[PDB]
Structure formats: C-alpha cells, structure tokens
Amino acid sequence: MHRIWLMYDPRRVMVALVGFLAVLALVIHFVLLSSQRYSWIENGTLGADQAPVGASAP
Amino acid sequence: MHRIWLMYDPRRVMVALVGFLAVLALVIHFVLLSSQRYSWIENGTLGADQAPVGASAP
Amino acid sequence: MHRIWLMYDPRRVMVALVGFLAVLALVIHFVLLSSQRYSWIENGTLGADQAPVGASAP
Amino acid sequence: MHRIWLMYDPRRVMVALVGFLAVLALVIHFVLLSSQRYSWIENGTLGADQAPVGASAPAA
Amino acid sequence: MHRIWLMYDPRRVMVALVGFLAVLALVIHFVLLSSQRYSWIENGTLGADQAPVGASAPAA
Amino acid sequence: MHRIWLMYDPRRVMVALVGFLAVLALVIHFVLLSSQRYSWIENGTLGADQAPVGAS
Amino acid sequence: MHRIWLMYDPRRVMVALVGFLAVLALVIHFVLLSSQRYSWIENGTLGADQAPVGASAP
Amino acid sequence: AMLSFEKKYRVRGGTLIGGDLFDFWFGPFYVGFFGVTTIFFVTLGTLLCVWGAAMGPTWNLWQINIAPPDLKYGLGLAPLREGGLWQIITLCALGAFGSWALRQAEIARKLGMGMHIPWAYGGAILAYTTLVVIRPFLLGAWGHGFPYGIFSHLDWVSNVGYQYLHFHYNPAHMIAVTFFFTNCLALAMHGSLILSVTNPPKGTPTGTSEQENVFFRDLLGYSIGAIGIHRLGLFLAVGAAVWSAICIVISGPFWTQGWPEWWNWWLNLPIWK
Amino acid sequence: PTAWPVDPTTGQTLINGRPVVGRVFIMRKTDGTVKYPNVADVVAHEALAPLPPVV
Amino acid sequence: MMEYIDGAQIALYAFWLFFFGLIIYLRREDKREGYPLESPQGPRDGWPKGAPKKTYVHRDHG
Amino acid sequence: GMTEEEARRFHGYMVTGTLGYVVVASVAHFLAWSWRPWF
Amino acid sequence: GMTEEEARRFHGYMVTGTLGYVVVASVAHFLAWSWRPWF
Amino acid sequence: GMTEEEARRFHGYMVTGTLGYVVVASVAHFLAWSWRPWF
Amino acid sequence: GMTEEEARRFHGYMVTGTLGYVVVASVAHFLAWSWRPWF
Amino acid sequence: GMTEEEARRFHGYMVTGTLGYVVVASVAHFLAWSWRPWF
Amino acid sequence: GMTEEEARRFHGYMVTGTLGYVVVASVAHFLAWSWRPWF
Amino acid sequence: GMTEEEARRFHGYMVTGTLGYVVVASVAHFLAWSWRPWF
Amino acid sequence: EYQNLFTRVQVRTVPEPGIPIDESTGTRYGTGTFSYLAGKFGDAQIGPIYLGWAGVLSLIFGFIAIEIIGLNMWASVGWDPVEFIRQLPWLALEPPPPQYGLRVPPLNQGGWYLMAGFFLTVSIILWWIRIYRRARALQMGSHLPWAFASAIFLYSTFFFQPLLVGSWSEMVPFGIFPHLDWTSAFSIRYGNLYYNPFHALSIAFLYGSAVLFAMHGATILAVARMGGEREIEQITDRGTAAERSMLFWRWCMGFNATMESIHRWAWWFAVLTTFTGGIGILLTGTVVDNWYLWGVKHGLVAPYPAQNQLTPEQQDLLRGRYQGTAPDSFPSYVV
Ligand SMILES: CCCCCCCCCCCCCC(=O)OC[C@H](COP(=O)(O)OCC(O)COP(=O)(O)OC[C@@H](COC(=O)CCCCCCCCCCCCC)OC(=O)CCCCCCCCCCCCC)OC(=O)CCCCCCCCCCCCC
Ligand SMILES: CCCCCCCCCCCCCC(=O)OC[C@H](COP(=O)(O)OCC(O)COP(=O)(O)OC[C@@H](COC(=O)CCCCCCCCCCCCC)OC(=O)CCCCCCCCCCCCC)OC(=O)CCCCCCCCCCCCC
Ligand code: BCL
Ligand SMILES: CC[C@H]1c2cc3[nH]c4c(c3C)C(=O)[C@H](C(=O)OC)c4c3nc(cc4[nH]c(cc(n2)[C@@H]1C)c(C(C)=O)c4C)[C@@H](C)[C@@H]3CCC(=O)OC/C=C(\C)CCC[C@H](C)CCC[C@H](C)CCCC(C)C
Ligand SMILES: *[C@H]1O[C@H](CO)[C@@H](O[C@@H]2O[C@@H](C)[C@H](O)[C@@H](O)[C@H]2O)[C@H](O)[C@@H]1O[C@H]1O[C@H](C(=O)O)[C@@H](O[C@H]2O[C@H](CO)[C@@H](O)[C@H](O)[C@H]2NC(C)=O)[C@H](OC(C)=O)[C@H]1OC(C)=O
C-alpha cells in the first residue's frame, strides 16, 4: 500500500493531514462546548444523571 | 472501465473525490445537527419513541 | 449517436454532466426538505395518511 | 433547410439550445410550484375537482 | 524517526510549533477567563464548594 | 541549548522576543486594570479582605 | 554586555527607545488623568483622605 | 509550485525585520517575519471569533454576533462575555491588518516594485481604525465600535445613520458616495476599453493604445492616457475610503445634531440671507 | 422551577435528587439571547396589524 | 402552497450558480500565462485547468 | 466548419431529436392534463 | 481527439452507465412513492 | 500519463477502496437505523 | 521522488503513528463515554 | 543539506524538549486539578 | 552567522538576563500576592 | 564601523544615562506617593 | 523614490491625433487642443468628439429633459432666481400622486415628471446606440456598451418596479436632496433594505470594485517604471513588469490574474454591481414587502434581548392605522 507515497509526496500529505485534523478537532470541541449537555467548562463536574438532556417528544 | 484513468489523472481525481466527500459529510452532519429529531449531541440518549417528530396532518 | 464524442471532448462533457447532476440533485433534495409534506428528517416516520397536504378549494 | 448549419456552427447551437431549454424548463416548473393551483409538492395528491381555482367575476 | 528533519527544515518547523503553542495557550486562557467557573481573576479565591457550577433549568 | 543561536541569529530575533514580551505585559496589565478585583488605580488602597470577589 | 552595541546600531536603538518611552509615559499619564482617583487637573488639590476610592466588597 | 518564469525571482533580500531567517516561501505564499505575525493574529483572532459564536445563541453564519461592551465601561476592557472578547479580537484584527501591509512591503521590495500597494491598502486600514479606534476613543468608549457579525454590523450601520436623523445629508458622506460611484464607472470603462482592443471581433487585428485613446476621447471629451487612468482609479478608490473615514469621524465627535440642519450655513450666506 | 431544590441540612443544591458541590447557576447563552423561531413568533410579540386607512 | 420557498430565494440561488460558474471562467482566464506550474513532482495545473495561451495577430499597417 | 454533405446528416439527427423531444413533451402534457387540466 | 472507434466504444459504457443510473433512480422513486405518494 | 497496464492496476485499488468505503458506510447506516429510524 | 524502498520505510512509521493516534482517541472516547454517554 | 547525523542530533534535543514541556504541563494540571477540578 | 564559541558566550549572557528578569518578576508576584491573593 | 573600544565608550554612557533616568523617576514616585499613595 | 503620481515633463506635438482612426459616416467636431492641467495628471489632449445621428438626437432629447426639470424647479420657487440658486439642492420635479396609479396625471401634478422621464430615457437609449456604433466603427469589441447596458438596467428598474406595483407615484423624484429622501423612504416602506440579499450582493460588488481598482491602480503604478502601464504590449508581449505584477499577488495571497484577465475581474465586478442591484429593486414590493421579515424567515436576523414587552391590551391599543388621505378641509371646532 506504500506506493500511495509514490503518487503523493509525504511532505505534502502530512501538511494536509495536520491541517485537516487541527481544524476538525477544533470544530468538534467548540461544537460540544457550545452545547448544553457538554458545556464541560461550566458543568463538567455534574454526574451523568445530572447533565442536561434535550427536550423529548410529548 | 479502467480506461477512465486514461481520460483523467488518478492523482487529480483522488484529490477531487476526497474534497467532495469531506464537504458532503460535513454538510450532512450539520443538516442533521440543525434538526430537532437528530440533534444527537443534546438528545442522542433519547429512545427512538421519545425522539422529536414533525407535525402530522390534523 | 457516438459522433457526439467527436463533436465534444468527452472529458469536458462528462465533468459537465457530473456537475449538472450534482447541482440538480441538491436542488431537488433541498426543495423537498424545505416543504411540509417531505421534510423527511423531522417527519419521515409519519405514515402516508398522517403526512401534511396543502389546502383544497373550499 | 440544412444549410442553416453552414451559417451557424452546430457546436455553438447545441450548447445554446440546451442552455435555453434548461433555463426555460426551470422557469416554468418554479412558476408552477409558486402557484396555488399547481403547487404539486404540497398539494399534488388533491383531485382535480378539489385543487384550488382563482376567484371568478365578483359582480362588483 | 529522525529523518522527519530531512523532509522538513527544522528552523521553520520550530517556528510553526512555537506559534501554534502560543496561539493554543492564549485561546485556552481566554476561553477559561470567559467562563463563570474559571474566571480566576475575579473569583480565583473561592473554594471548590463556592465555585460556580452550570446547570440547565429544571422547568418542572 | 546554546546551539539554538546557530539556528536563530540573535541580532535578528531579540527585537522579536522583546516585542512579544512588551505586548504581553501590556495586555496582562490592562486585563487586571479593568477587573473589579484588581482595578488598582481606583481601588488599590482597600486591602485584601475589602477587595471585591466576583462570586455568582 | 557592551558587545550588544556590535549587534545593533545605537543611532536606531536610541530612537526606538525614546519613541517607546514617550508613548509609554503619555499612556500612563492618560490612564491616570482618565481615572477617578488621579484625575489631578480637576481634583489634585484634594487631600489623600479626600481623594476618591473605588467600591469595596459589599 | 511555481509559475514557469517564477524561480529566477525568488531571491533573498528586501525584508524589513527578519533578515534571512524567515525569508522563504510556503507553496505560493511568501512568508517573512510579518507572514509569521499575520498567521499568529489571523489564527488567534479567528479562533476567538469561533469561541464567540460558541458562547452565543446560534451557529447560523448570518446570525453570529460578537458585540462590543456597554458604554459604561468607557476605555477599559470589559468582562470577556460582556464585550472584552470583541476588544481582544479587535487587537488581533489590527495586528493582522498591520502585518499584512508590512508583508506586502517586503514582497514589493523583493520584486523591485514601488510601494503603492502597501499604501493603497493603508486607506482601508485607516477606515477600519477610524471605526473601531479613533471614533470610539473620541467618543470616550470602546462600546462605540461596530459588532462583528455579518448582519449585526448592518444593524449598527442603520442605527448610527439614524442617530443623525437623515445621514444622506452628511456632506463628507456625499463626497465618499460620489467617489465610490465614480470609481465603479471608471472601473467599467477601463476594463471595457482594454478588453475591447485585446478581444476585437473575429477577423480583426489586435487594437492599439491609439484606438483606446480615440474612443476614450470622444466618450469624455479628453484623452486620459494609460498612466492617467491608473492614477485616477487609485485616486477614486482610495479617496472613497479616506472620505468615508472623514464622514464617520465627524459624526458624533464633531457634529451631534441631525445632518440636514448642518446645511443652515448655506442658506445664510449674506448675499441671500 | 426557576431554581433547583436546596438541601435544608447543608444549603447544597440538589439536581435530580443528588447534591452538587458548588454554587449552581442556570446556564444561558450570551445575555440570554435566543434565536428567532419564525416570522409568526416575531409577529406574535408585536402589536396587532394596523387598521385600514381612512380615505 | 410552498411556505418556505419564495421567489427571492429562488432568484438568489440562480445567482449563486451563475456566480460560481463565473469564478470558474475567470480562473481559467487567469491561467493563460505562467502555466502549467513547475514543481519538484512535475507539471501542475491546479483547478480549473487553464485555458490555452493565446496568440495575438498584429496588423499590416496603413 | 463543415461541408454541405455533413450539414445534410447533422440536420437529419437534429430534426429527429427535436421531433422526439416534442413527442416526449406531448406525452408529459397528456399526463399532466389527465391529472389536473389547466382549462 | 477520439477516433470514431474510441468514440463508439466510449458510447457503449456511457449508455450502460446511464441505464444503471436510471434503474437506481427508478427503484428510488418507487420506494419514495410507496412511502409517501405525491399524486 | 499512465499506460493501460498502470491504469488497470490503479482501477483495482480504486474499485476496492470505493466498495470498502461503501461497506463501512453501510455498517454506519445499519447502526444509525437501529438507534433511531428515519422512516 | 522517493525510492520504493523509501516509500516502504515511510509507510511503516505512517501506519504506526496512525494506529497510535487511533488508540489514544479510542481511550479518550471511552473516558468521555463513561463520564457522559451521548447515546 | 544537514546530514543524517545532524538530523539525529537535532531529533534527540527535539524529543527531549517536547517531553520536558509535557512534564511541566502535567504538573500545572495537577496543581489546577487540586485548586478547582473540572470533572 | 555566528560560530559556536560566540553562541556559547551569547547564551551565557542571555541565560543570566533571563534569570534576572524572572527574579524581578518573582518578587513582583510575591508583592502582589502579599497585597491581594488571587487564589 | 563600531569597535570594542567604541562600544565600551557608548555602553558607559548608555548605562549611566539609563540609571540616571531611573533615579530621577524614583524621586518622582516618592513625591507622588507622598501626595497620594496608590496602595 | 519617484512615485509616478504626476508628470514633471510633458511633450507637445504640433500635428496631432484627434483626427480619428478611419471612421466612415458622421463628423469629427472641433479641433484638438492641449490642456497643461490635463497633461499634469493624464494625457494633455482635450479634443474632437463624434456624435452621428444617435448622438445628436440623444443631446436634443436630453436637453429637453434637463430643461423640463430645471424649469419646474425654478417655477417651484416662484421664478425667484436667488431662491433658485439658494434652494437648488432641495428643489424637485416630483412624481404623480398615488391615486392615479398608471393613468396620466395632471400637468402640474406629475405630468411634467413623466415627460422628463420619457425624454431622459429615450436620450439614454440613444446614447447607448451612439456608443455601440462607435465601438464597432473603431473596430473594437462590444464590452463597453454591454457594461453600460448594466447601468441602464438598474436605471430601468426605477420605471419597471413602479410599473409592477402599479403606480407612477413610486418613481424617483428629479432633485438632489429629494432623490435621497426617496432612497431613504424606499428602505423604510419596504422594511429595511439591508436585508434584501441582492442589495447586500450589490454592495459586495460595489466595495469589490473599489478593492480591485485600488489594487490594480497601485499595481500598475508600482511597475510603471518598468513599462507596466503599456498594458496592451504587456498582454501581447509579456515583459518583466507583468511577471512582477503576477508574482506580487501570487506571493501575497496565493493566486494571481494575468495582465489581460485582471480587466475581466474588473469588468464583471462593476457590471454585477448594477445587475444585482436591479434584481433587488424588481423583487421589492412585488415578491417581498418587508425584507426584515424575509430575513427572519430565512435566518438572517441576529437576535437581541427584548427592549420592551407588550401586554395583550397594549397590542390592541398600539396598533395604528395605515396612513390615509390628507384632510381636505379646515374644520371649525367651535361647537
Ligand atoms: C482560516 C482563517 C482565514 C483564512 C482563510 C484562507 C486560508 C488560506 C490558506 C489555505 C491553505 C493554504 C495551503 C498551502 O498553501 O500549502 C502550501 C503547501 C506547500 O507544498 P510544498 O511546497 O510542495 O511542500 C511543503 C513541504 O514539503 C515542506 O514544508 P516546510 O518545510 O517549508 O514547512 C513546514 C510547515 C509545517 O510542517 C508540518 O506541518 C509537518 C510537521 C511534522 C508533522 C509530524 C507528524 C505529526 C503527527 C502528530 C504527532 C503529535 C505528537 C507528537 O510549516 C512551516 O514551517 C512553514 C511556516 C508556517 C507558517 C508560519 C507559522 C507561524 C506561527 C503561527 C502558527 C499558528 C498556528 C497555525 O502545500 C502542501 O503542503 C500540500 C497542501 C497542504 C494543505 C494544507 C491545508 C489543509 C487544510 C484542510 C482543511 C479542510 C477543511 C474542510
Ligand atoms: C459574495 C461576493 C464574493 C466576492 C469575492 C469572490 C472572490 C473570488 C476569488 C477567490 C477564489 C479564487 C481563489 C483561488 O483560485 O485560489 C487558487 C487555488 C489554487 O490555485 P491553483 O493555481 O489552481 O493551484 C495551485 C496548485 O496546483 C499548486 O500549488 P501548491 O502545491 O504550491 O500548494 C497547494 C495548494 C492546495 O490548494 C489549496 O490549499 C486550496 C485552498 C483553498 C482554495 C479555495 C477554496 C474556496 C475559498 C476558501 C474557502 C475557505 C475560506 C475561509 O495551496 C494553494 O494553492 C493555496 C493558494 C490559494 C489560496 C486561496 C485563498 C482564497 C480565499 C478566498 C476567501 C473567500 C471569502 C469569501 O484555487 C483553488 O484551489 C480552486 C479554486 C476554484 C475556484 C473557486 C470557486 C469554486 C466555485 C464552486 C465550483 C464547484 C466546486 C469547486
Ligand atoms: C564620577 C564617577 C562615578 C561616581 C563616583 C562617586 C564617588 C567618587 C562618590 C560617589 C558617591 C555617591 N554617588 Mg556616585 N558616581 C557616578 C554615578 C552615580 C549615579 C548614576 C545614576 O550614575 C548615582 C545615582 C550616584 C549616586 C551616588 C550616591 C550613592 C553617593 C552620594 C550622594 C549622591 O547622590 O551625590 C550626588 C551625585 C550624583 C547624583 C551623581 C554623581 C555626580 C558626581 C559625578 C559625583 C559627586 C560625588 C560627591 C560630591 C561626593 C564627593 C566625595 C569626596 C570627593 C571625597 N552616582 C559616576 C559613574 N559617586 C559618594 C559616596 O560614596 O557617598 C556615600 C562618593 O564619594
Ligand atoms: C457598471 C455600473 C456603473 C456605470 C457604468 C457606465 N456608465 C456609463 C458607461 C458605463 C460603462 C458609459 O459608457 C456611459 C458614458 O457615456 O460614460 C462616459 C455612462 C454614463 N453614465 C452616466 C452617469 C452615471 N453613471 C452612474 C453610475 C454607474 N455607471 C455605475 C456605478 C451614475 C450614478 C452613480 O448616479 C450616473 C449619474 C453618464 C455620464 C453616461 C451616460 C450619458 C448619457 O446617456 O447622456 C444622455 C444625454 C443627456 C442627459 C443630455 C445632455 C444635454 C447637454 C448638456 C445639452 C447641451 C446642448 C446640446 C448641444 C443641444 C443639442 C443641439 C444639437 C443640434 C447638437
Ligand atoms: C373637513 O372635512 C375633511 C373630510 O372629511 C376631514 O378630514 C377627514 O378626517 C381625517 C381623518 C382624514 O385625514 C381625511 O381623509 C378625512 O377623512 C376634516 O377633518 C374636516 O372635518 C370636518 O368636516 C367633515 C366633512 O366631511 O365635511 C365632517 O365629517 C362629517 O360630516 C360630513 C358632512 O358634513 C359627513 O359626510 C361625514 O361622514 C362626517 N364624518 C364624521 C367622522 O363625523 C367632520 O365632522 C366630524 C364629526 O368629524 C368635521 O370635523 C370637525 C371636527 O368639524
């Protein structure tokens, strides 16, 4: 499978990968931090039974 | 079928395809995370019969 | 009608067709998703008689 | 009639024609979809006797 | 493992690393200082039994 | 660690470091200066038991 | 320590220093003049007991 | 990658600060010391904007709104939730825009070009600096800056305009608008003329400076010439931004009534008082 | 239902029947803002529609 | 009738489709000089692929 | 460009394809009319 | 540029891909129809 | 560009990777359907 | 461009780092799940 | 450029500096967790 | 650039300026702590 | 340009002037503290 | 370093251009001349103009339009020549009253307005034809008349949108401050034009036109010492001035135009300013009547905390009426 590194220069792929994973990681953390349930800075010490849950159907 | 790779440089198509799938996956996830029924971060622990449903005809 | 591929470069036509189908499918899906009757992410689980319908003549 | 293709390059015309037809088709569909009578996505299941009709002469 | 430095110039990988860490460190501090629980300049002397905890409304 | 200066010729980067430190010090002072607890220009004389705490 | 002047042109350093200190002095005076406690052009004659103080902890 | 003629031009030299240390490229981009500082301020400022969105009511791109502090905080830094985050982002934006201008100077110096581009961009930086620094400082509170939000800043523009009842009557605003409209006209004329001599009808030779000067002459009655139209375009576009900065800095710090009643001086000239 | 129950024996807040260590506050987004649901909801908060003109 | 879709929204997406088509056209035009790009991995076009380099015919004078 | 011999056969395809499209559209209008007449 | 042979060979794949696409679309429409018909 | 033999080698990887990805996505949809069906 | 020996040598490190990263992420998810499960 | 011996020498410093920095960060988190834990 | 013996000599001063600066800062922090603790 | 001797001479002045400035500024702070102390 | 902002040495030529390129029908009007002041900033020749049939008629039709406007403005201050100059920016020729709809109104109540609008419109169309014929006579592309057609399109929407809503009263008054009063009241009537997305787009291209001309003006001046202002030769015979211009922007922002294609970016940004503008006007009052509420529906509008809250009886009390007719009497209140 290594011949993928003949089609693509590893120096370029690792730059693309580090860029992609940096953006994706920051996206997910900020999305969670914006939520009610996973606003862990304000509420991280609540237990699972105490954490918010989004409104159910009637 | 393989002659398609004589029409198009596979190095270029693979870059195009990964670009398309990345955008498409992010769009689908954000559509679902905008919704009521699939706001899984806030309500993902609800059972399938507790999850929101849009209105019926009266 | 194969002389159309002498008339037009198939590499350009096939990219044109892919772009056309991509745009058209996205348009139709988003039109339906913005309707009431076919807002399937919120209401896809409703039965066919429970799905919304627009008003009749009085 | 075929000498029209000597005046006009068919490679330009077919593109211009496809463009016109695609625009025209989309224009007509969206004009109908915006109407009351033919908003078929929301009301397409209504029978022809119960689809909307614009109001007749008001005897004003 | 050390041949990463034949692929990339260490003089500028170190610049990009230090800059990333400085940006990251400043972000996390400004994020914490924005919070109520960790607004340490105004409330850092509160003991953990007095520190804020966020909850959802009960809405019973 | 002295070999760092063979990567980064100091005459080209001391004004960088000093510029970084001067701005960072100014930011920290201005952050403190307009907090309630550390607005020392207006309230520096109070003493610790009288100084504000931003409790909820 | 004097070999620092073999790295940097004193003609430029002395200008950069005097500029910096002039800006810094002007800022600190403006910060004090904009305060309540040290707005000395209006309240400078007040005794140190009479000068304003910010609010205590309630 | 490089343009087919590019490699010859990629020499060292022309930097302002870093010397050879940062004197390199990353893909197409020149880096340099101000490239490094640019990316620092861009990344910090962007991630703080994303944090502002996270702690706000929605992720909808149009509705995100990072607002300045209340006016009661004056020239202090407010609590970060309360506008201090806007104040930090404003410092990053100043740092980024300044870094971008100085990086352009390093690039112009390396290519042996004149410094026109860095200075022309200074006209935009001036206008931004007026809106968020100079005008708020003269009014005595950072809370007078505009909010960072794609539509919420348009709500700010609307309300600032009606703070003077009928902002169209602002005389510097009339000049600024005239420059923006004249610029867009001149851009269309210059773009059209060059394309019309380089893309004449099929079976026609490529045109010449003489033809575009002849056409331009019977459009405006005079021929501006090749250097003249570029001087004019620079004058109009940058002059619009400078008159924009004037029109907003006079509104509030120097004039407080409605703008229509500013014109009372014209009615009272003694030849017709 | 604007605040969670308090344990009288400690002053400690009880969330879902169980104590929390700390001062509980109800979380909200910046300044309590909430995105507008609908035109119908925005209009429901306004005055009624104006009466017809006198001509 | 369609509640959400309206003629201003339709017209706006018609413009977006045109505008992205225009940007593609302009980027093809931007690549008539200096392309294909030199790189260590051989020639590179970016995207979209540039239009060909254009020859100009001068006049025979009078 | 093209010769008249080429224009001759292109016209044959062009006329045929046009008529086929008009035929398919004729069925679509037949179906649309049967569902919901506009007059 | 294609030879007419390459054109005629490519056309066979293009017709086949179109057919496969229309088949999938036809199944998809009939799944959609039986879940929530639009007429 | 590629020889036809290189194009044939790449096609093997491309088809296998495409079908592999669709299988992984098929399990993702199986899991998602069992958690919260959308019809 | 790399020798195939160099591609072989790089691929070993690339797989090993990817595996390591996936392990750390898998532990991180199970800690997050134990503290506050999202389903 | 730099030789494999230079790369290897630099790598040893670089790994050590990273691990030392990570150790210092670990103690900072130990202190912060003692002051005000976040879970 | 400079030689290693220059770099060692410069490093000796730079380290000592760093320690001097940190000492002044350490006294400044302990004065501030004495005046108004932040934990 | 500069020399060890030239640098030493300038350094003597630069150090002396800096320290002289800081001395005068310390007397201004003494006067300001006597007038209206800030802690 | 020389900035190339003004010309310290001009040169005269005693014979001159201004005698046109070979042009056929019509006549070259006047003799060429030099302005030393024009020569400081640009090319010095101020000189002969071409009209032809379409240019002559355009000036006749346009002059009448200007006369009708000015005479009505002057009549509106009772023929006072002092008040005509003193009050000039507040004067208008004003569109018809709303109750007429599209019917012909009285002469002093908008009849002169529609006449001036008609002759101005004919004059603008005849000027477009004059430009189109001149571009072809000089053997040029048609880029300039189509750019001018974009401006004419926006202008025509100040006729078609009043037509579509059904009243000439909605048209723009001829007058300096009065047309700005209309511009504000249009945004008020239709519920804040900032939320019209084509207005937002039109601004994006108006600003972008300034961005591009600032960038392009500066770029060419920055390479003018290397002949970069000889743009046609830099297009046909690329020199180092073009290469440096491409490399500057490539190294700055990661991509670049060419010496030709930057003029296409320029052309489309200017043209799209008025084209998107016209679409936004045509949609206003015909498809959308309150753009802020369209913004709320489509999620444009950022939320703010409520500044007031109405009770239900206030909701009935605080509704007004839509504005009606003015009182056509002077009531006595004595009993
Ligand atoms: C968005 C905002 C609005 C702004 C919005 C607009 C944004 C505009 C920017 C858009 C992206 C532009 C990208 C670009 O131009 O790239 C040029 C480059 C050049 O290709 P090349 O010339 O052929 O190859 C270069 C390479 O061979 C040699 O690179 P060099 O040696 O010169 O430089 C090294 C790099 C970074 O090095 C690395 O990343 C690798 C480090 C080792 C990784 C080891 C594995 C780690 C595993 C984890 C272990 C973990 C445990 C140990 O950096 C430099 O030194 C150059 C200077 C950088 C700039 C200065 C930075 C200053 C400090 C501040 C930094 C702050 C933080 C960024 O191209 C490539 O490498 C290939 C393409 C790379 C794509 C990168 C972007 C991908 C983003 C994907 C996001 C997708 C979202 C949907
Ligand atoms: C409403 C009125 C609007 C009014 C304002 C409208 C503004 C319009 C102008 C801006 C857009 C054009 C930007 C551009 O062309 O940059 C050159 C770049 C690559 O150049 P290349 O010559 O084709 O290829 C170079 C490559 O072969 C060799 O380079 P190297 O090996 O050294 O480095 C590697 C490359 C890898 O590429 C990338 O990383 C792409 C980065 C992102 C591309 C743009 C994505 C969309 C916009 C940004 C979204 C993310 C933004 C946060 O690294 C580079 O080449 C980096 C240099 C390019 C940096 C471009 C930065 C543009 C930022 C635009 C910001 C727009 C803000 C609205 O091009 C591309 O990557 C493809 C661009 C295709 C046209 C864009 C429009 C597409 C419309 C949608 C069609 C269907 C999907 C494509
Ligand atoms: C000229 C070469 C030296 C010098 C040589 C001496 C000598 C010799 C003596 C002092 C002494 C003192 N110096 Mg010393 N001093 C210098 C620079 C300084 C600087 C400075 C910012 O650079 C400062 C703040 C001081 C400060 C001081 C005081 C701690 C002290 C006496 C009080 C004083 O301030 O007098 C005011 C002085 C100044 C503000 C600046 C210097 C002015 C002139 C050049 C020296 C005046 C000396 C004074 C008249 C004493 C005479 C002693 C008899 C000759 C025996 N000096 C220069 C660099 N200094 C005396 C001491 O140790 O007392 C305890 C002492 O005998
Ligand atoms: C792409 C959008 C931009 C745009 C573009 C644009 N405008 C253009 C063009 C272009 C590309 C032209 O080619 C065209 C032009 O000619 O430019 C010089 C024009 C034009 N843009 C104009 C104006 C204009 N453009 C504006 C805006 C814009 N123009 C947009 C920003 C505005 C604004 C912002 O409000 C204005 C006011 C004109 C200067 C010109 C069109 C001139 C025209 O049509 O004139 C008609 C004639 C008259 C009104 C009559 C004049 C009467 C004389 C004073 C009478 C003298 C007596 C006479 C001799 C009597 C007759 C006797 C006979 C026997 C001779
Ligand atoms: C003069 O007449 C005009 C026209 O009616 C009045 O203006 C009306 O009211 C305004 C709200 C509106 O802007 C305008 O369009 C118009 O509708 C104006 O105020 C004056 O009113 C007095 O005269 C009225 C009149 O029409 O002559 C009179 O109206 C009443 O009497 C007439 C018969 O004389 C009858 O036809 C009307 O139906 C009747 N209307 C009402 C409401 O009573 C006004 O009398 C009263 C009580 O309103 C006069 O008003 C006064 C105070 O004298």
Ligand SMILES: COC(C)(C)C/C=C/C(C)=C/C=C/C(C=O)=C/C=C/C(C)=C/C=C/C=C(C)/C=C/C=C(\C)CC/C=C(C)/C=C/C=C(\C)C(=O)O
């Ligand atoms: C909010 O919810 C939303 C976000 C919307 C939901 C959606 C989410 C979506 C769509 C997510 C998609 C995620 C994804 C998709 O694939 C994620 C894919 C992730 C992947 C693949 C990660 C891979 C990481 C690999 C790493 C870390 C490798 C490290 C390698 C190292 C350390 C060795 C380097 C080489 C060396 C040292 C050799 C030198 C020797 C040399 C050179 C020699 O010797 O020659």
Ligand SMILES: COC(C)(C)C/C=C/C(C)=C/C=C/C(C=O)=C/C=C/C(C)=C/C=C/C=C(C)/C=C/C=C(\C)CC/C=C(C)/C=C/C=C(\C)C(=O)O
């Ligand atoms: C709000 O919450 C949000 C923010 C959203 C939550 C999310 C946060 C996220 C996603 C965080 C991610 C963090 C992360 C991810 O990887 C973090 C990764 C961090 C890393 C890798 C740190 C590495 C540091 C390394 C250092 C310090 C090295 C120092 C080296 C030194 C000192 C020696 C240099 C060598 C010399 C001097 C020798 C020269 C000799 C020479 C030349 C010779 O001899 O030749």
Ligand SMILES: COC(C)(C)C/C=C/C(C)=C/C=C/C(C=O)=C/C=C/C(C)=C/C=C/C=C(C)/C=C/C=C(\C)CC/C=C(C)/C=C/C=C(\C)C(=O)O
């Ligand atoms: C919410 O956010 C907020 C509120 C902001 C919170 C978060 C804050 C954060 C994250 C802060 C981080 C701070 C930080 C991180 O590293 C801070 C790091 C600080 C550092 C490194 C300080 C180092 C200082 C070193 C100095 C002064 C050295 C001076 C040396 C001198 C004078 C000698 C010069 C040489 C000579 C004389 C010899 C010439 C001889 C020659 C030439 C010869 O002999 O040849």
Ligand SMILES: COC(C)(C)C/C=C/C(C)=C/C=C/C(C)=C/C=C/C(C)=C/C=C\C=C(C)\C=C\C=C(C)\C=C\C=C(C)\C=C\CC(C)(C)OC
């Ligand atoms: C003796 O000569 C004197 C001294 C009087 C000459 C001096 C004159 C002066 C001083 C003139 C001053 C003029 C000024 C200051 C004018 C200001 C004009 C401005 C600022 C105008 C701004 C906007 C106007 C717009 C947008 C108007 C648009 C009008 C349109 C599109 C009208 C179209 C009308 C049509 C097509 C009419 C058709 C006729 C039919 C019968 C079909 O009716 C509908």
Ligand SMILES: CCCCCCCCCCCCO[C@@H]1O[C@H](CO)[C@@H](O[C@H]2O[C@H](CO)[C@@H](O)[C@H](O)[C@H]2O)[C@H](O)[C@H]1O
């Ligand atoms: C679901 C829809 C179902 C109905 C669709 C019907 C579409 C029409 C199908 C017609 C099939 C036969 O169509 C016929 O093909 C032949 C051979 O290709 C074309 O023949 C064409 O090319 C040949 C040479 O190749 C010329 O000699 C001839 O003059 C020219 O017309 C005809 O122009 C066309 O009439």
Ligand SMILES: [Fe+3]
């Ligand atoms: Fe130009």
